[PDB]
Amino acid sequence: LCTHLSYSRSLSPGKAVFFYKTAESDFVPLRIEVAKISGQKCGYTEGFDANLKPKNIERYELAYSNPQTIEACYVPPNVDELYCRFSLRVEANSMRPYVCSNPDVLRVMIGLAQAYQRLGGYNELARRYSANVLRGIWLWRNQYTQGTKIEIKTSLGSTYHIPDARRLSWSGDWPELEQKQLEQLTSEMAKALSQPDIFWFADVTASLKTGFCQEIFPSQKFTERPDDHSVASRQLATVECSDGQLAACINPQKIGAALQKIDDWWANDADLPLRVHEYGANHEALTALRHPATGQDFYHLLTKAEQFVTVLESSEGGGVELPGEVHYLMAVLVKGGLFQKG
């Protein structure tokens, strides 16, 4: 192909904030607190050296405590509902390369995006993204509630409401008056993703029914180990409110990673879906599912466009003929990045 090729990102979210209501004011932030604790002396190198060779210490030396400083966050007594919200904008921005160093490569990438659009296929991507919003998986470790409600508004005037999100699976069929809203939402998004000159903007709120003083899990900061012992080892992310107070939040890219978890196209065995990645990275197992050695990765597939366009053009469309390799590639172009040295 060519020395330089790249796309920017087409689907971008905001920062999510936690808050609650009172009888006296409509918006009170949830906030974090800091505290000293007494820890344990446990684990390897604490008692063993090399490969299971005990080291020489006295019996009493492990009964001592290990103090630490952490930040933490809890819902205060007597709050019945906790609320969380974020904004979302979607642009039809995978139709054109941000940069390209070769006119012959450029005309081909354009041909492909269009050949795909008219046969169907944006619906498929929209259905998958839509499902992840309405399921609620973007709450990560805070999904364990006594009841979760999700509400969405858009710039076109529509409103959607899931009376209880706790049971919607990835694989399966949704209850009536829920399955239907998934279809309607799919239509708005499928268009926003591919047709330009449409402004679309969404506002997603949810509510969590909680326990008496339940623990809450906001995003964590990346830090250096302090050398002071007066500074926290585990620091949490907050956002500044319009009134000057700070509140617990979830970072944009953490919301984003959840929304794009849609890849169950690998190895012809769906399992659970992966975060889209050029090499099929699997963070839980610390490995990769589309190792270059298999021929299944993005970079091998990027060179078969001429063959794919030929098929797309020869196909009738409107059926189930689109192959995994074409869908995969379109999903990667949506999460744009650097595809150079080709």
Partner: protein, 630 residues
């Protein structure tokens, strides 16, 4: 003493060696060993022994090939290719740069070398100028050669080295291709586009490390992992480099006119309404009507600030009647006539002159009628509320604070191109204004995606590319863009307002840009064709925000900046753009058309309170308040 090593460090003031060339060769040669092996840098014996080792010296001579004036690897050790040696650009009166500094060189390559590079790349003051060992030997400086031969070097060994040492400084001064890990950005220049790649100046950064600690300037520190892999200075500083830090600085009274009654003409006007006999109907009517017209105006003025309060507050979004009765529906206003007329007489009663007129029967109906009339009568692209998440707070490698102005000029243009592809008519942006309502610094740093395989083949492990130390912030800001349409017939329509919303970019200063939230939406994208209406609305902004204006002062050094900042409280340094190192050329690796190298331009700006322009007036605001390129 460790102080000797400090004074020979790249971040310290240079010291003189005139008449001490013998011990200077001894100390400088001794520095090529690890600190653990040397009890003193002053031992003549060790030096005489080190000098006889052609291999040790050969390994030292080889480091000369990568001495540079500008460091292409500074922000990112991954950059691979050739060194860069360029004389400082001509001085620009309005820009701080390397143009005002003397010639200096540094070293970067392998982590391992550090010590071996110190023999030739270490500078010092000699014959009252700035030099180093490599330059004195290449130039055939006899005093240094006589001392060096005296320390045990054979004349034949020196005759060969003078040649090889000189040869290493005679080529590879400009890169052949653009390296794949370098930065590339493009702007209009002389009617067409050119790609610019910035680079950090060695001499300029090294001076800043000394000035901020001596002059007591506001500063912070940026960390680098593996200092030996980035450069001479970063290693010497232990991986901690200082930068500048200058962030932005982010009633029960009568509402009635304070002097409408201080006009002697007003008093006369009243006398004319009262009037006099002896004149004809035409004369009396002319004098009377004129007085009434005058008074009518005064009635409008008298209630002016009050009506102003209403319109401003009500349109934009306590308890006293002159405040609450005006807040009410305009349809109700006619019923306040008797109350207004009452207050009017009272205001006259409380005035030194009005004691002759207040509540006089003659003025009753006149005043009431004109008030009743008045009551019956009463009955540029502005982008508002924009939010940016995670903006880059580090403008240039030398300065933290307000985001680089080169980025806003950039934004104006990407927005213009998007709009131009939507509207058939030519559209052009003369100027761009910046206002600051919220500024919050965010701590910590981002974790890179695992985009790099541990091994190219037969490995199922993923590694992290590396880590950088940056600074980020969240913004809230408004923009006022001066929009111009070349065609005689314009398109001031709803369609164009929709297209203005669509064209708006999603990216700003490296962060993410959003409109005001949907549940509280108002018209954030209005258009004005009147300076009076637009200025009036802008005067209503909250007092805790900042307008940023261009500065007048010309600064040529950090010391001049230190004094200017000590004297003012409104002055802040900013990044303003780039200064070229060479003319634009065709070069392999360029994204589009010609390529040029440049160094960052440091300039200044002023922070002005909303209260200062309420008083300065629309004249000064529209002359001074707008920024442009060139």
């Amino acid at each position: 003493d460790r102080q000797l090593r400090r004074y020979l460090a790249p971040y310290s003031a240079e010291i003189g060696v005139d008449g001490a060339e013998k011990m200077a060769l001894v100390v400088l040669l001794n520095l090529t060993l690890k600190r653990d092996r040397v009890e003193s840098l002053c031992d003549e014996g060790l030096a005489r022994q080190l000098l006889s080792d052609e291999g040790h010296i050969t390994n030292c001579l080889h480091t000369v090939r990568w001495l540079h004036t500008h460091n292409l690897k500074y922000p990112d050790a991954r950059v691979s290719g050739e060194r860069l040696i360029i004389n400082a650009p001509p001085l620009i009166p309005g820009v701080i740069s390397s143009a005002g500094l003397p010639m200096r060189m540094g070293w970067a390559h392998d982590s391992s070398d550090i010590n071996l590079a110190k023999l030739f790349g270490t500078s010092f003051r000699y014959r009252d100028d700035s030099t180093n060992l490599a330059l004195q030997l290449v130039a055939r400086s006899k005093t240094w050669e006589q001392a060096l031969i005296g320390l045990g070097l054979t004349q034949q060994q020196l005759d060969i080295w003078c040649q090889l040492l000189a040869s290493n400084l005679e080529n590879n001064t400009f890169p052949t291709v653009v390296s794949p890990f370098s930065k590339q950005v493009r702007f209009l220049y002389q009617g067409n586009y050119c790609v610019v790649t910035p680079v950090v100046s060695h001499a300029l950064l090294a001076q800043l490390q000394n000035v901020v600690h001596e002059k007591k300037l506001q500063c912070t520190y940026i960390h680098h992992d593996h200092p030996a892999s980035v450069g001479s200075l970063v290693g010497a500083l232990g991986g901690k480099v200082a930068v500048l830090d200058y962030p932005p600085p982010v009633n029960g009274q009568s509402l009635f006119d304070r002097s409408v009654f201080n006009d002697h003409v007003f008093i006369d006007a009243l006398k004319h309404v009262i009037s006099r006999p002896g004149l004809t109907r035409k004369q009396q009517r002319q004098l009377r009507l004129s007085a009434l017209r005058y008074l009518r105006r005064q009635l409008a003025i008298w209630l002016g600030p009050i009506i102003e309060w209403r319109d401003e507050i009500v349109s934009s979004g306590s308890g006293g009647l002159e405040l609450e009765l005006i807040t009410q529906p305009k349809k109700m206003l006619p019923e306040l006539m008797l109350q207004v007329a009452g207050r009017f007489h009272l205001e006259l009663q409380n005035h030194s002159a009005g004691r002759r007129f207040a509540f006089h029967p003659a003025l009753m109906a006149p005043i009431k009628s004109q008030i009743l009339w008045l009551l019956r009568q009463l009955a540029y692209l502005h982008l508002s509320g924009l939010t940016v998440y995670d903006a880059s707070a580090l403008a240039n490698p030398y300065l933290c604070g307000i985001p680089s102005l080169s980025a806003l000029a950039g934004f104006c243009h990407d927005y213009e191109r998007r709009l131009q592809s939507l509207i058939g008519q030519s559209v052009y942006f003369r100027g761009l204004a910046w206002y600051l309502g919220r500024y919050s610094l965010v701590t910590g740093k981002h974790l890179p995606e695992p985009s790099k395989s541990a091994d190219p083949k037969s490995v199922s492990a993923i590694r992290r590319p590396g880590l950088l130390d940056g600074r980020y912030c969240d913004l809230g800001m408004d923009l006022i863009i001066e929009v111009h349409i070349p065609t005689g017939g314009s398109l001031p329509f709803t369609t164009c307002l929709d297209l203005l919303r669509v064209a708006l970019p999603a990216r700003f200063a490296g962060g993410c840009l959003h409109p005001p939230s949907l549940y509280e939406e108002y018209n954030w994208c209005t258009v004005y064709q009147d300076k009076s209406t637009l200025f009036t609305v802008l005067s209503r902004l909250p007092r805790y925000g900042c307008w940023i204006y261009p500065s007048d002062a010309d600064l040529r050094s950090f010391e001049e900046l230190s004094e200017a900042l000590a004297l003012d409280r409104r002055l802040r340094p900013v990044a303003t753009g780039f200064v070229f190192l060479e003319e634009p050329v065709e070069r392999a690796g360029s994204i589009e058309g010609q390529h040029v190298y440049a160094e960052s331009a440091i300039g200044t700006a002023l922070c002005i309170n909303p209260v200062e322009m309420r008083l300065a007036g629309k004249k000064r605001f529209f002359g001074a308040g707008f920024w442009q390129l060139n």
